[PDB]
């Protein structure tokens with residue numbers, strides 16, 4: 001059983017935990033699916049293979065409406081291919097930030113689904129460990145949509161990368177016992193409690209300028225309902241949170257018992273009989289929170305893609321150089337395709353043609369391969385550049401066009417860019433920056449922060 005015999009790649013869905021997720025189509029039935037591809041080289045394995053294979057076969061037999069459905073598993077010399085159901089509703093928080101109203105009832109409905117999925121996985125002795133908002137996908141982009149939890153089972157068998165672009169935003173949700181090494185299924189209740197806290201206040205209970213500051217707060221395990229917006233929240237909501245954020249895991253409430261809590265029972269009634277004050281301050285805070293996380297994430301991805309495109313620019317140039325036996329710097333369509341594939345080994349027809357459209361619209365003859373390389377690599381970094389700009393614009397909620405030094409400090413702290421380093425970089429871009437930057441200056445900073 002070879003993966004490529006059955007599935008063809010259609011389009012990339014993203015780079016989630018442990019590797020790329022590619023939208024694929026069954027070659028016979030047309031069935032679309034989301035395949036997580038884990039590189040055995042890039043990602044280390046924790047357990048023996050037998051244990052991994054058994055857990056995988058178990059997961060194929062489990063079905064729950066709030067857990068991502070796993071269909072199939074493949075393996076070759078380099079990779080694992082995990083074939084899951086594709087969900088098109090995006091990440092929960094990216095929906096939440098577009099809503100005009102949000103109440104305790106909305107929060108309770110969300111958390112009841114998460115707790116239902118978790119309870120079922122815990123019954124089968126499967127622990128997530130890395131539960132966070134990113135792992136809550138929607139079937140459709142609407143507040144009416146079901147939540148599907150992704151990544152159950154992976155933490156037990158795969159080591160997470162320490163690359164900051166991957167470990168960004170993780171510190172808020174991780175249980176203290178996970179930091180110290182002894183953990184069980186209760187760690188998922190803790191992570192869910194942090195998410196619930198954020199839904200109801202828009203602020204993480206354990207917050208900080210950078211990873212270590214956040215982790216230090218999580219380890220001490222102390223948090224409060226001191227913020228003004230907690231006055232708008234029921235005592236019942238707060239009581240559940242206290243049980244879910246109980247430090248010693250044996251004293252911490254179970255996912256199953258959390259489903260039986262008064263708050264869940266009361267606020268998830270299909271008929272909203274209780275007061276429904278919109279948590280307006282929480283929505284504004286959550287928008288700020290999401291915006292900050294997505295911008296820091298986009299910033300790191302942009303720098304990563306800039307480095308990647310630097311390499312591939314040199315490699316592709318060398319590839320074409322070898323093919324340039326004439327030494328005239330010009331190649332035809334055929335040769336450009338071969339070289340583009342030669343780099344890929346280190347759809348293709350159509351991508352080349354998009355480049356040739358800009359270079360030689362008429363296509364009357366040969367193409368300066370140097371001209372080609374630029375446009376080829378330039379447009380390949382488009383997604384990251386456009387996503388960076390979109391994230392900047394979304395973070396800039398008042399449409400000021402600027403981000404302040406306080407905001408830069410938050411964004412770079414989350415990104416693990418050193419305070420003195422980015423300040424120095426700012427000074428070089430704009431000596432009279434006046435404690436704020438526009439998008440262009442922000443982008444210039446990112447470029448200097450990755451050796452450009």
Ligand SMILES: CCOc1ccc2cc(-c3nn(C(C)C)c4ncnc(N)c34)ccc2c1
Pocket residue numbers: 013014015016021034035036059068070082083084085086087088137150151152153154
């Ligand atoms: C034993 C677990 O095996 C799997 C198999 C498939 C998976 C697909 C996704 C997924 N990511 N994304 C984007 C956010 C990058 C998705 N988008 C839509 N649907 C999806 N299903 C995913 C995540 C985890 C998965 C784990």
